[PDB]
Design a protein around this ligand. Structure first.
Ligand SMILES: Nc1ncnc2c1ncn2[C@@H]1O[C@@H]2COP(=O)(O)OP(=O)(O)OC[C@H]3O[C@@H](O[C@H]2[C@H]1O)[C@H](O)[C@@H]3O
Ligand SMILES: Nc1ncnc2c1ncn2[C@@H]1O[C@@H]2COP(=O)(O)OP(=O)(O)OC[C@H]3O[C@@H](O[C@H]2[C@H]1O)[C@H](O)[C@@H]3O
Lengths: 124, 131
């Protein structure tokens, strides 16, 4: 089925769903973030769709969208702000270090593909 | 729908070369000292000057047990999406060690985020303006 099995199991604010089918690289390129709560009339309090860059950027027929490092950079910024604020935590600091190292590995991939001159194409 | 182009508002990213998108924080600091609206916008624009990509991410603003709260996305949602995409890419033809390391770190970040949630349930402070 469609809903993601999440690491968080208790008191989840939102459900996340993959929409559509597998595409380039074997990945999905549309996701829905959905409130677990509803308003008085049965509507979701939150219903957001995230659409990924589908097909590499230099190939024809490719569809523009967000990329995964965008999401990680937003979360990185949020954790940095929370850590500079009144409600910091050790858990935040550990999560932030892992988020930044993930981003560093994603950039490692980007720079390797620039070097092998395959960035933006469907090549190993 | 939005025409092209503070750099104080744009996020300084880990990636420096061949960025697809610019990420910008919208608005002011809010609860916890954090921003709760971000825009992801393509570095390319069409023939008429409009962004090819212009998407807004709005976060749950104000803790869930407090008044005034505005419903929205939470950070672990974004990370679970990235986790799923990395898992898919790793099961596909274009796997990599870089993907594997990024995936392990993303999942451990999510594990610390859930660790925080469970610690806050234990202290009975989840959803409140409490350290
Ligand atoms: N961690 C990964 N992130 C992205 N893509 C990955 C990863 N691991 C493997 N891939 C695959 O290599 C191709 C070229 O990617 P790329 O050259 O890095 O980048 P891009 O130009 O930014 O396009 C990005 C889009 O490309 C399409 O193909 C991708 C995937 O099939 C996809 O639909 C992307 O959403
Ligand atoms: N890693 C963090 N994630 C979220 N929030 C964090 C973190 N680190 C510190 N905070 C701060 O503690 C408060 C209580 O958060 P919580 O009990 O986890 O909140 P919640 O019910 O899930 O609501 C969530 C919203 O709450 C508001 O305040 C938050 C923040 O000021 C914010 O606008 C949130 O976007």
């Amino acid at each position: 089925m469609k809903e993601l099995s999440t690491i968080q199991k208790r008191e989840k604010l939102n459900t996340v769903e993959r929409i559509g089918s597998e595409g380039p690289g074997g990945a999905y390129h549309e996701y829905v973030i959905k409130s677990n709560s509803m308003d008085s009339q049965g509507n979701y309090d939150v219903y957001e769709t995230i659409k990924f860059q589908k097909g590499a950027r230099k190939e024809e027929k490719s569809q523009h969208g967000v990329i995964d490092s965008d999401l990680l950079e937003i979360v990185r910024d949020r954790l940095k702000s929370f850590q500079a604020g009144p409600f910091s935590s050790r858990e935040n600091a550990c999560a932030l270090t892992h988020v930044e190292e993930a981003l560093m590995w994603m950039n490692r991939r980007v720079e390797d593909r620039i070097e092998r001159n395959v960035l933006g194409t469907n090549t190993k």
